[PDB]
Amino acid sequence: SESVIEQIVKYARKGLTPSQIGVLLRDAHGVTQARVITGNKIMRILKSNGLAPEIPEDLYYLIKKAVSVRKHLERNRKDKDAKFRLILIESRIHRLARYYRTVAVLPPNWKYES
Amino acid sequence: EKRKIKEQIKAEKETALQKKKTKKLNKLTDILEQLTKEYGAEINADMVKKITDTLLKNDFKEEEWDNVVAELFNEEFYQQRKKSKKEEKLQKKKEKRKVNELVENALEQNKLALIEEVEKEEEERKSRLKFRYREVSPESFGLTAREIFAADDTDLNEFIGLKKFAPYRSKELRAKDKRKVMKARRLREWRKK
Amino acid sequence: MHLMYTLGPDGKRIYTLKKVTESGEITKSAHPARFSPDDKYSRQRVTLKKRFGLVPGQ
Amino acid sequence: INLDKPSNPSSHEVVAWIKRILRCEKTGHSGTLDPKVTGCLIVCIDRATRLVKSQQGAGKEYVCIVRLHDALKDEKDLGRSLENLTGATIYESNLIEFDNKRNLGVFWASCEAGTYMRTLCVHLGMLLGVGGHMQELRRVRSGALSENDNMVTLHDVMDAQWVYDNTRDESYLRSIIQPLETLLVGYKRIVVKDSAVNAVCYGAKLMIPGLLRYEEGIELYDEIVLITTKGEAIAVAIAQMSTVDLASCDHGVVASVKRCIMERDLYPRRWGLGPVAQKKKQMKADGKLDKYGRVNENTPEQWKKEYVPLD
Amino acid sequence: PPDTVLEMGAFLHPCEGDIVCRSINTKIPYFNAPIYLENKTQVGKVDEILGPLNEVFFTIKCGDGVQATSFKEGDKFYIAADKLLPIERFLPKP
RNA sequence: AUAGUCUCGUCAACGCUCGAGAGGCAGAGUCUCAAGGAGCCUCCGGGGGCUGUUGCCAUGAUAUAUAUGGAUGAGACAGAAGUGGCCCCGUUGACGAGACUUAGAUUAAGUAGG
RNA sequence: GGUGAAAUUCUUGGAUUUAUUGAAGACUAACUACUGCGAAAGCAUUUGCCAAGGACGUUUUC
């Protein structure tokens, strides 16, 4: 499946999420069993090709949610609920970023910005 | 209402994809029949698959279809009773159907490319952060992609974890893990088991 | 269509192109109506034919 | 059913539609119409589908319209050209009407298939020199029945089935549907006793004691119909003696069943009840005749002289 | 409460405090069979069966506390599947 | 045993419209096509006629496209989808499979016992 | 007016009541609820817009 690996590398060059890339590969190949191709296998194939993500997928999705609720607070400043949960998710992503810095997957030089 | 709108959009996208697929398929088999008539000899399925891959990479249109016909005119692509007669014609029709099935398999190989082309056409009709990958050192780890796909995800995780293959870690630990994992006896035992 | 007919004195068809014969009788169309198996209009036809006694066997 | 086929579908599709409407177990037809051709179609239902093979090769009569490409200089010569093409395939033909301003001619002909009508139109246009093609085609007679012999449409069949399903009236279905014996009018009739009807339905060769009446003009190896006194048809058979031989002899075989139309046990089983039959049974039981019934050594010579096996 | 319900009737007329319904289903209900709504709630009992064979109607006698004017056109009324009879049962025997 | 009848699946031969498709029929959705417009004249703002054997849409079908048809219709999506909605030539002979009989056709007032 | 009985106040200039108009702030009568939602605070007029969730299933570079 060298052509499949080339297509996976081309999709990874398009800035797609590894889970989204695996879902697209399963949809294109018609994989009835999800155990054959998984996100861990996609990450292993990307490491074999030499591509590793800059940020974790969960941290990226949390940052996207934080950006969305920040845009909502910019639209509506009178709301208390979105501000409170923004404080909560910033606490959560700060804890996860500290865990990632200790695990050294995320470089310790990079710091989360509010 | 949102569910109905999403279902309608999905149905429209599926119909557009089906129309693009059948247009590509019938033009491609017409070009293949024309090339078979011009050459006068049977064409291998591997050469047809290579030509289909080249056409998919070329992003073929009608002018690019003429260009593909010209490339087929080049030497590289050119080199690549009555009841019994009716049965032979039926066998030839079955061979043509097998060639069409090979063309459909090639289109399924480029189904990601076809979906990308359909999405580009939809974006052109509409006329309207990011995730980045850092560079890392490649390691094949002695296993091919087909060999990895022929093994379970649990066995691959047990053999080598994602944390053990951390890209932003020290190189000495990665070298030690590679040296401990590249044993020929362990690989032979895993292959035999 | 072109094939037209009138019913003869003995009950047999006589075919012609002409819309009106020499005697002045208006000719009929020799071709029957289109049919579909999914015809859901048997009830209306039977009712209207029963109002005027045009059902065979009535 | 004598049916007026519409000009969109084919004959087989119409037959399959009738099978769905009437909920038949089996439906057939003898003559096949092209999809564009309209006209007479004979539809056989269930047991009537046994007659379909006997209905093959029957005479067909068509009424056709030919369109001429150019106006004619001489009118009646057209009829002469029609007389040039009839006979030795179109057997007989007759030009009903012609309009030179409309360039259209309607004519009746006796033919075998609808394609020969198109060939006749092309040949008429070629022999005239102006050129012509088929405009419309209609079959006005297929087989024994014609278009005047109670022809109904598919709407009539659907409406009659709806009437019987919902109103429970049977007169409209009985009006549209004809007995299968309408297909057997031209055959020569032989009347069978009610005791022999079930034996003939079981495949036995009809003999002298089962015979009641025989039609004059029956020849050797001729197609016949075996009928009861109620007029229903038992079978289509091959006659084995002529009329004078039917009148003359006292023992013999008169018919052999080609195709059995009647249901097997519609009549009770009354064979083996007779003087000669019970005499043979008694001598078989006693041992004068053997188990199969052939001549044995213990059989007296009087029975051998009086009785001869026909088989 | 019934285990399963089937689409029995469609609202046609509220006449005289009873519900007239076109019989959507192709089988004949029991007399005095309970009629339910799709949350399996009893609205009334079958009072009368009428109409031709092609178009069967039935009249539901509403239970107490239910008014006939409260319903609207296009409403559906449901019955337990045990309370049905084949149409060929009432037809004359061959 | 022999023979016949009914319901079937295969082979061979013989004819025909030469027979499973990018097929046809039936059905559902969307779109297009009906001299519904325009200009002249008129008779009493309305009505009639003409340009108008015109224009619009479909068809090269053994084919006059200066033609033939148009709602009692045609075409595109559709070389698609669907068929678990239907249809795709007959005759003769042989073989094989499930069966029913092996039939000479009675009775001018009954059946079963003592 | 209100009270157990009272009392303070308003006025024949019209108190109070009834009908209409204009302006201001507030709220969403019954259904209606210690079994719904929310971390709490608290939350039922119509119509849109925005962001985020609860329970369930498939799972996760976990």
From Swiss-Prot, chain A:
List of residues that carry Phosphoserine: 3
Keyword Metal-binding: no
One GO CC annotation: cytosol
Transmembrane domains' residue ranges: none
This protein's UniProt keywords: Cytoplasm, Isopeptide bond, Phosphoprotein, Ribonucleoprotein, Ribosomal protein, Ubl conjugation
Localization per record: Cytoplasm
GO BP terms, alphabetized: cytoplasmic translation; maturation of SSU-rRNA from tricistronic rRNA transcript (SSU-rRNA, 5.8S rRNA, LSU-rRNA)
Family: Belongs to the universal ribosomal protein uS15 family.
Record's subunit section: Component of the small ribosomal subunit (SSU). Mature yeast ribosomes consist of a small (40S) and a large (60S) subunit. The 40S small subunit contains 1 molecule of ribosomal RNA (18S rRNA) and 33 different proteins (encoded by 57 genes). The large 60S subunit contains 3 rRNA molecules (25S, 5.8S and 5S rRNA) and 46 different proteins (encoded by 81 genes).
Protein name (record): Small ribosomal subunit protein uS15
Organism: Saccharomyces cerevisiae (strain ATCC 204508 / S288c) (Baker's yeast)
Residues of the full protein shown: 30 to 143 of 151
UniProtKB/Swiss-Prot annotation, chain B:
Stretches for region Disordered: 113-129
Subcellular location as annotated: Nucleus, Nucleolus
UniProt modified residues of type Phosphoserine: 137
PTM comment: N-glycosylated.
Superkingdom of origin: Eukaryota
UniProt subunit comment: Interacts with KRR1.
Function: Required for 40S ribosome biogenesis. Involved in nucleolar processing of pre-18S ribosomal RNA.
Other remarks in the entry: Present with 1780 molecules/cell in log phase SD medium.
Family recorded in the similarity comment: Belongs to the KRI1 family.
Name of this chain's protein: Protein KRI1
From Swiss-Prot, chain C:
Annotated coiled-coil segments of the chain: none
Keywords recorded for this protein, A-Z: Isopeptide bond, Nucleus, Phosphoprotein, Ribonucleoprotein, Ribosome biogenesis, rRNA processing, Ubl conjugation
A GO term, aspect molecular function: telomerase RNA binding
Name of a matching Pfam family: Nop10p
Gene Ontology biological process terms in this record: rRNA processing; rRNA pseudouridine synthesis; snoRNA guided rRNA pseudouridine synthesis; snRNA pseudouridine synthesis
Sites of Phosphoserine modification: 36
Record GO cellular component, one term: box H/ACA snoRNP complex
Cross-link Glycyl lysine isopeptide (Lys-Gly) (interchain with G-Cter in ubiquitin) placement: 28
Nucleus as UniProt keyword: yes
Subcellular location: Nucleus, Nucleolus
Keyword Ubl conjugation listed: yes
Quaternary structure and partners: Component of the small nucleolar ribonucleoprotein particles containing H/ACA-type snoRNAs (H/ACA snoRNPs). The protein component of the H/ACA snoRNP contains CBF5, GAR1, NHP2 and NOP10. The complex contains a stable core composed of CBF5 and NOP10, to which GAR1 and NHP2 subsequently bind.
Family: Belongs to the NOP10 family.
Protein role: Non-catalytic component of the H/ACA small nucleolar ribonucleoprotein (H/ACA snoRNP), which catalyzes pseudouridylation of rRNA and is required for ribosome biogenesis. This involves the isomerization of uridine such that the ribose is subsequently attached to C5, instead of the normal N1. Pseudouridine ('psi') residues may serve to stabilize the conformation of rRNAs. The H/ACA snoRNP complex also mediates pseudouridylation of other types of RNAs. The H/ACA snoRNP complex mediates pseudouridylation at position 93 in U2 snRNA. Essential for growth.
Stated name of the protein: H/ACA ribonucleoprotein complex subunit NOP10
Swiss-Prot record, chain D:
Species the sequence originates in: Saccharomyces cerevisiae (strain ATCC 204508 / S288c) (Baker's yeast)
Glycyl lysine isopeptide (Lys-Gly) (interchain with G-Cter in ubiquitin) crosslink site(s): 188
Name the UniProt record assigns to this protein: H/ACA ribonucleoprotein complex subunit CBF5
Function: Catalytic subunit of H/ACA small nucleolar ribonucleoprotein (H/ACA snoRNP) complex, which catalyzes pseudouridylation of rRNA. This involves the isomerization of uridine such that the ribose is subsequently attached to C5, instead of the normal N1. Pseudouridine ('psi') residues may serve to stabilize the conformation of rRNAs and play a central role in ribosomal RNA processing. The H/ACA snoRNP complex also mediates pseudouridylation of other types of RNAs. Catalyzes pseudouridylation at position 93 in U2 snRNA.
Ranges of biased composition (kind: Basic and acidic residues): 283-294
Subcellular location: Nucleus, Nucleolus; Chromosome, Centromere; Cytoplasm, Cytoskeleton
Broad enzyme group: isomerase
Oligomeric and partner information: Component of the small nucleolar ribonucleoprotein particles containing H/ACA-type snoRNAs (H/ACA snoRNPs). The protein component of the H/ACA snoRNP contains CBF5, GAR1, NHP2 and NOP10. The complex contains a stable core composed of CBF5 and NOP10, to which GAR1 and NHP2 subsequently bind. Also interacts with NAF1 and SHQ1, which may be required for assembly of H/ACA snoRNP complexes. May also associate with the CBF3 110 kDa subunit (CBF2). Interacts with the trimethylguanosine synthase (TGS1) and with NOP53.
Any single Gene Ontology cellular-component annotation: cytoplasm
Domain PUA: 187-262
